[PDB]
Design a protein around this ligand. Structure first.
Ligand SMILES: Cc1ccc(NS(=O)(=O)c2ccc(CN)cc2)c2[nH]cc(C#N)c12
Lengths: 424, 73, 81, 799
């Protein structure tokens, strides 16, 4: 049984309790056809609409132009103006991953930080990496590698502010872009954890976990360093005039300056945690079976929790290793292959990591090695789901995806705070 | 019977009277304007450690005590 | 590609990224299709996963069909289209 | 824009009432929570003796009395709506009264969404810990021990994400919670043992039990019996391990039980409150054992009589109960052994005025000329009335006009010397196929009546409550219902206005309706009806069919401006006396609030903040001037001047947005920048341009709240604001807060999305407190004008 809308409105008058959580069972208030709000229609390119922003003012979309001649793709991001029944008005056009040769079509995802609305992050990856050969039909793929493209773009300003236009363009129109390769077992994509802390992004590059913070500051000198208040750390400054990042406004690289600059400056911070060093340390100092250990073959890192208040990162380390069996002699004690897990808390402030839990050694009696990672990842999903606590609305990581060009179904673009749908 | 109600004092409500019918907007209690400073004994604080991080930490401490008590059987 | 699998009886909170994470170790995945419910905006609990090689799909099927994922036994089977 | 917010009438609705021995070990106290107000009383021979009224810097969400080991008397625990927790102690040194803050601190978590049933605070019977249910899937534990300098609180994960109610059980080895939760299978009851040592839950003494789908309350039965009582819509159950007793009385099925109170210290009798105002008595049959323990034999409910629609019930002494009402007047009732002629065992001793909820009001110069008087629509259901408030010389004078039904809207027609009141009465269907009234109300007791004879809509369930909407023509002197016009079957009257349209010299009563059928939930059709109360009789002039619900309706330069669902429409009154559409505006979600000043229209949307339209006389259409881009769920709007606009949101906040004066491009011309932010702590339903004083700084806007609080909003100059802001900051360094809550933190604009300090607003209540403090402790003056009586005393003249 569903109550009538006027009955709910009547109750608000006498109770003083009005909330979206109360009106959740209520159907959408307004749903506009995309065709009715889009302009200069006809066959108007290949606009793949992503969805509303958290503020509900902007609607994003992207285009993937191939250029059928070889072929290298170009990815463009757009920002539109929602005015209910009125036509969409374009407010920003940006080229993504500048000076990058994209062979295969990328599965891209646009994200927003929980409370930092000044910028958006765009992840992009291909099924397999482009090889170094060619087999008539195409360049072909490398079955052992995958490409990861990460880019951070600034959101258009709400209005006004420092209008120092030296004739167009302004203060916060920066772009950052990076690219790294990953090996098997290809790291999992965890956008809700990777962006749980504002202005930061946790990146798994198989060999290490990188915490990247990007921030802009003005005349005053109160807020300094998000990450790291030893292990490798880098902090660089940029003014207009280890994961390799090349910055830009809307053109090319801005002038990389130092601390003595006055006006407006951007800061890029990177704190890295070497997996192999962590694995070796935990086994050497905290493992009860450390004496039997010989060498580890492979590892798979999964994030369990991110605490943005205490700046702590909880990771699970799935490990394939080789060790001697228990000291009991029943014959030949030839070493065996075992699978286990290591849980470590990474303190972003201090940089020190602490051991939380050390698993036992489970014997791999001829498993497909693929099943080992499939089983280990199921236990991570089991753990996260088990300890899942509902968070506050407006504190969530808005993940936007439209897998329209990848043999995929998107029909509605919802703004569940204003009860608005964009029926595609 | 349903009655034989508690009595904390027989004198309560024995001299109560109000010469009015359905009218009492008297906010008689005098407002409290605190001007003096008296310190507090305690300060309420929340434990900053995550619930999952806390559980995995103490469960590992209990698992260590089960194996670290092997000086004697 | 050579084989298309049907993944069903999934918990509504299980994401496509989680589905990728569990199945990817068996072999190359051509595409994933986790079906969403337009009204609610949440998952339907079923999907389709297409492997690039038939062999990898069968091995994934044998190790994942009928085993618990977040306390709910997962259903993995063959579907042509 | 700079404003000054002050209180004319403090909130009068009762939100919570608790008893104990707070002021002394022998004194029997009654503590009343009136939103932010904490009224302290002492039960004596003459009744309730007033002590003091503690003004908290926060909405009282939890109020419990407890006595730990080796304590002289009871201590109070207060938890605010902004998660400010404090333990208070009462101390009196002959004549000097002081409230000591034993412990204080904020207990909010960045994670966790607030629960659907709100904040629940419970104390262990042995005073071992404090249990807080703030967010979904969490349970905060505050240990109690004066040995440590701090009180390390912690969270324990709760597998049940949708908890209805929770209580601490009596007679247990370890603190044990008992709660009702909901899940896809339905509603159940579960218990957990709280371990302070391990900081986790343990296996509950008794487990899984399938309870009613509408099981809403949990009762912790004291030490002798033990266990818990669960109250639902159809049944009352008892649980204590394998021991189970359930009763299904048909009398309680007609209305929802919403409050309880323990009468006997052993738990033999319980009072139960109903949504209809019916008072019950839950009896627990004792069964003494030869072991020395006691058990339960039966359960029985007995109808005592009728009281006010109670929020909290509280037994005081000698068969006298305090009825804490929020939808009507509070009472002092007497439980007698002998029933009267009506068959009621309860009789009223005293009635306390409650103005809340204020759903609509108007300012009129009733008796005499030039002295304003508020005429509100107060209360709901059988508690519904009209309150006439005025500043009387020889502070406030209220006159109650009981209606015995929910009033909705009010307007004044001076040419007719009467008021137009929309009202709604509840009717129950029987075996005759038609509905009957529960009690005689204002619409059924009118001198003359009429029924709508419209045929616009040419083409029910037994025991279902249906609303019957009427238009009441009430005299201005006697307040007698002169006429009651009954609308169509399944028709809800929403908006009401009294004006003259076009060149027509007749003043009309215009009503906006909506069709509410039991089949569909969405309002797909309505009407705009034009009435005229010529001389003792009402006449239907015209009707215009609409494709929705007519939410707001305001007169606009001799035209009828109306909001129909998501459309803001303008109507013209033709020579044939019909309404003709002129122009429309469709860029809205739920246009519920409209306000006009000249050619400008301030549109208030329920979900999409506020918007400013301008009517073009040459073109004959609207123009979207500016918009407030910040997301806000509106409750009420008001136009301050041509450039500034006042708003009230769902998070109990006030804001003022204006046209950007430094804007150069047209896109910047469309951005309403919020210049004023303030946390009021109330939920505003209506704004009014007026003043209760006979006619320093311009502006005077009255507003009515859900708690019955009436305030004023006056505009200040930039010089006066900078003076009052420094005086306000200097006043907080001399005036202390109970619970050590920063005033700056309390008045801060707080939402589940963002938190920002207060700006462009002055707390008038804090400023006027300067007159009540002692002469030596008034050194907030550091330049002279030592005698600052010229100010404040002149500021109090606005009331
Ligand atoms: C274990 C795990 C955890 C989390 C993943 N993503 S998230 O986007 O961070 C996330 C989504 C949904 C919830 C709760 N509704 C919590 C976090 C993951 N993505 C692949 C995973 C694997 N294997 C995996």
């Amino acid at each position: 049984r569903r109550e009538h809308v006027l009955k709910q409105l009547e109750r608000v008058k006498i109770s003083g309790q009005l909330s979206p959580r109360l009106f959740r069972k209520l159907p959408p208030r307004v749903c506009v056809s995309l065709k009715n709000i889009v302009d200069e229609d006809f066959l108007y390119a290949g606009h793949i609409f992503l969805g509303f922003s958290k503020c509900g003012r902007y609607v994003l979309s992207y285009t993937s132009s191939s250029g059928d001649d070889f072929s290298f793709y170009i990815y463009h991001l757009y920002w539109w103006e929602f005015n209910v029944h009125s036509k969409l008005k374009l407010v920003r056009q940006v080229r993504l991953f500048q000076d990058e040769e994209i062979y295969s079509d990328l599965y891209l995802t646009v994200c927003e930080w929980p409370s930092d609305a000044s910028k958006v992050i765009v992840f992009g990856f291909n099924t397999r990496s482009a090889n170094g050969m060619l087999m008539n039909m195409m360049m072909m793929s490398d079955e052992n590698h995958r490409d990861i493209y990460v880019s951070t773009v600034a959101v258009p300003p709400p209005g006004r502010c420092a209008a120092c236009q030296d004739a167009q363009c302004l203060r916060h129109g920066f772009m950052l872009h990076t690219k790294y390769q990953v090996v098997y077992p290809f790291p999992t994509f965890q956008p809700a954890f990777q962006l749980k802390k504002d202005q930061v992004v946790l990146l798994n590059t198989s060999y290490s976990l990188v915490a990247c913070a990007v921030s802009v500051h003005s005349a005053g000198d109160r807020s300094f360093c998000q990450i790291l208040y030893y292990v490798n750390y880098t902090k660089l400054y940029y003014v207009l005039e280890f994961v390799v990042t090349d910055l830009r406004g809307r053109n090319l690289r801005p002038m990389r300056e130092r601390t003595a600059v006055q006006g407006q400056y951007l800061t890029v911070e990177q704190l890295t945690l070497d997996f192999e060093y962590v694995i070796n340390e935990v086994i050497r100092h905290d493992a009860t079976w450390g004496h039997q250990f010989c060498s580890f073959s492979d590892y798979d890192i999964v994030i369990l929790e991110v605490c943005p208040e205490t700046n702590q990162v909880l990771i699970n380390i799935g490990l394939l290793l080789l060790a001697f069996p228990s000291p009991t002699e029943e014959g030949q004690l030839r070493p065996k292959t075992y699978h286990t897990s290591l849980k470590v808390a990474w303190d972003l402030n201090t940089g020190i990591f602490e051991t939380v839990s050390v698993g036992d050694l489970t014997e791999v009696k001829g498993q497909t090695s693929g099943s080992v990672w499939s089983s280990y990842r199921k236990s991570c999903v089991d753990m996260v789901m088990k300890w899942l606590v509902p968070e506050s609305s407006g504190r969530y990581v808005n993940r936007m995806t439209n897998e329209a060009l990848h043999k995929g179904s998107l029909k509605v673009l919802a703004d569940s705070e204003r009860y608005t749908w964009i029926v595609l | 019977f349903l009655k034989g109600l508690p009595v904390y004092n027989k004198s309560n409500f024995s001299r109560f009277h109000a010469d009015s019918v359905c009218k009492a907007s008297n906010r008689r209690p005098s407002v409290y304007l605190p001007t003096r400073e008296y310190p507090s004994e305690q300060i309420i604080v929340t434990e900053k450690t995550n619930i999952l991080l806390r559980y995995l930490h103490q469960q590992w401490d209990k698992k260590n005590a089960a194996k670290k008590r092997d000086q004697e059987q | 590609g050579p084989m298309r699998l049907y993944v069903g009886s999934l918990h509504f909170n299980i994401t496509e990224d989680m589905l990728r994470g569990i199945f990817e170790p068996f072999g190359r995945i051509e595409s994933i299709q986790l079906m969403m419910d337009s009204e609610t905006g949440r998952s339907k609990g079923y999907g389709f996963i297409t492997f690039s090689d038939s062999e990898c799909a069968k091995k994934a099927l044998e190790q994942l069909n009928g085993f618990e994922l977040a306390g709910r036994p997962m259903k993995v089977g063959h579907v042509t289209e | 824009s700079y404003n000054y917010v002050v209180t004319a009438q403090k909130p009068t609705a009762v939100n919570g009432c608790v008893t104990g021995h707070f002021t002394s070990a022998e004194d029997l106290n009654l503590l009343i929570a009136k939103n932010t107000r904490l009224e302290i009383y002492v039960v004596t021979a003459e009744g309730l003796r007033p002590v003091k009224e503690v003004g908290m810097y926060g909405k009282i969400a939890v109020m419990e009395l407890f006595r730990p080991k080796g304590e002289s008397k009871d201590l109070l625990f207060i938890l605010t709506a902004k998660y400010n927790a404090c333990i208070l102690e009462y101390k009196q040194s002959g004549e000097s009264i002081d409230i000591i803050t034993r412990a204080h601190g904020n207990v909010q978590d960045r994670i966790g969404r607030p629960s659907e049933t709100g904040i629940i605070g419970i104390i262990d019977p042995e005073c071992r810990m404090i249990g807080l249910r703030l967010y979904d899937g969490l349970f905060k534990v505050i240990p109690l021990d004066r040995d440590n300098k701090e009180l390390k609180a912690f969270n324990i994960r709760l597998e049940e994400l949708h908890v209805i109610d929770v209580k601490f059980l009596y007679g247990c080895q370890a603190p044990t919670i008992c709660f009702v939760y909901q899940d896809p299978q339905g509603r159940h009851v579960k218990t957990y043992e709280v371990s302070l040592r391990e900081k986790e839950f343990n296996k509950g003494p008794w487990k899984q039990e399938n309870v009613e789908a509408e099981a809403s309350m949990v009762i912790a039965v004291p030490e002798p019996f033990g266990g818990a009582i669960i109250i639902g819509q159809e049944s009352i159950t008892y649980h204590n391990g394998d021991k189970y007793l359930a009763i299904a009385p048909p009398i309680i099925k007609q209305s929802t039980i919403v409050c309880h109170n323990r009468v006997d210290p052993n738990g033999s009798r319980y009072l139960l409150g109903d949504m209809e105002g019916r008072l019950f008595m839950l009896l627990l049959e004792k069964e003494e054992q030869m072991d020395g323990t006691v058990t339960l034999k039966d359960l029985r409910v007995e109808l005592l009589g009728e009281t006010s629609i109670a929020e909290c019930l509280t037994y005081l002494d000698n068969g006298v109960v305090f009825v804490g009402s929020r939808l009507g007047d509070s009472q002092l009732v007497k439980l007698n052994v002998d029933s009267n002629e009506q068959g009621s065992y309860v009789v009223a001793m005293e009635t306390f005025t409650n103005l809340g909820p204020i759903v609509d009001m108007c300012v009129v110069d009733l008796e005499r000329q030039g002295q304003g008087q508020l005429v509100t629509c107060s209360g709901a259901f059988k508690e519904g009335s009209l309150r006439i408030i005025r500043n009387g010389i020889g502070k406030l004078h209220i006159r109650t006009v009981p209606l015995y039904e929910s009033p909705r809207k009010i307007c004044y027609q001076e040419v007719s010397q009467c008021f137009g009141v929309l009202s709604s009465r509840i009717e129950v269907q029987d075996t005759s196929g038609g509905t009957t009234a529960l009690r005689p109300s204002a619409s059924t007791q009118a001198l003359s009546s009429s029924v709508s004879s419209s045929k616009l809509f040419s083409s029910t369930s037994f025991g279902e409550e249906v609303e019957v909407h009427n238009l009441l023509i009430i005299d201005q002197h006697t307040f007698e219902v002169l006429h009651a016009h009954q609308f169509l079957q399944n028709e809800y009257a929403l908006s009401l206005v009294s004006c003259k349209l076009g060149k027509d010299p007749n003043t009309y009563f215009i009503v906006g309706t909506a069709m509410v059928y039991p089949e569909e939930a969405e309002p797909k059709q309505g009407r705009i009806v034009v009435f005229q109360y010529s001389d003792g009789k009402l006449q239907t002039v015209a009707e215009k069919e609409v494709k929705g619900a007519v939410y707001s309706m305001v007169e606009f330069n001799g035209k009828l401006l109306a909001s129909i669902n998501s459309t803001v429409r303008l109507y013209e009154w033709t020579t044939e006396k019909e309404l003709r559409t002129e122009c429309n505006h469709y860029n809205n979600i739920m246009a519920l609030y409209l306000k006009t000043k000249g050619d400008f229209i301030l549109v208030g949307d329920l979900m999409r903040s506020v918007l400013l339209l301008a009517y073009k006389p040459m073109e004959g259409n609207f123009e979207e001037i500016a918009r407030d881009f910040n997301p806000n769920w509106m409750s009420a709007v008001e136009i301050l001047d041509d450039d500034n606009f006042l708003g009230a949101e769902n998070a109990f906040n006030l804001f003022v947005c204006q046209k950007d004066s430094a804007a150069t491009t047209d896109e910047e011309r469309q951005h309403l920048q919020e210049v004023g932010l303030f946390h009021l702590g109330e939920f505003v339903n209506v704004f009014c341009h007026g003043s209760l004083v006979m006619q320093p700084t311009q502006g005077s806007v009255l507003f009515g709240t859900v708690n019955g609080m009436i305030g004023l909003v006056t505009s200040l100059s930039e010089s006066w604001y900078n003076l009052l802001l420094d005086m306000q900051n200097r006043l907080n360094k001399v005036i202390k807060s109970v619970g050590k809550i920063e005033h700056s933190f309390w008045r801060s604009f707080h939402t589940e999305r963002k938190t920002e300090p207060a700006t462009g607003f002055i707390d008038g209540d804090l400023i006027e407190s300067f007159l009540d403090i002692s002469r030596p402790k008034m050194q907030e003056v550091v330049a002279t004008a030592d005698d600052l009586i010229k100010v404040v005393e002149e500021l109090t003249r606005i009331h």
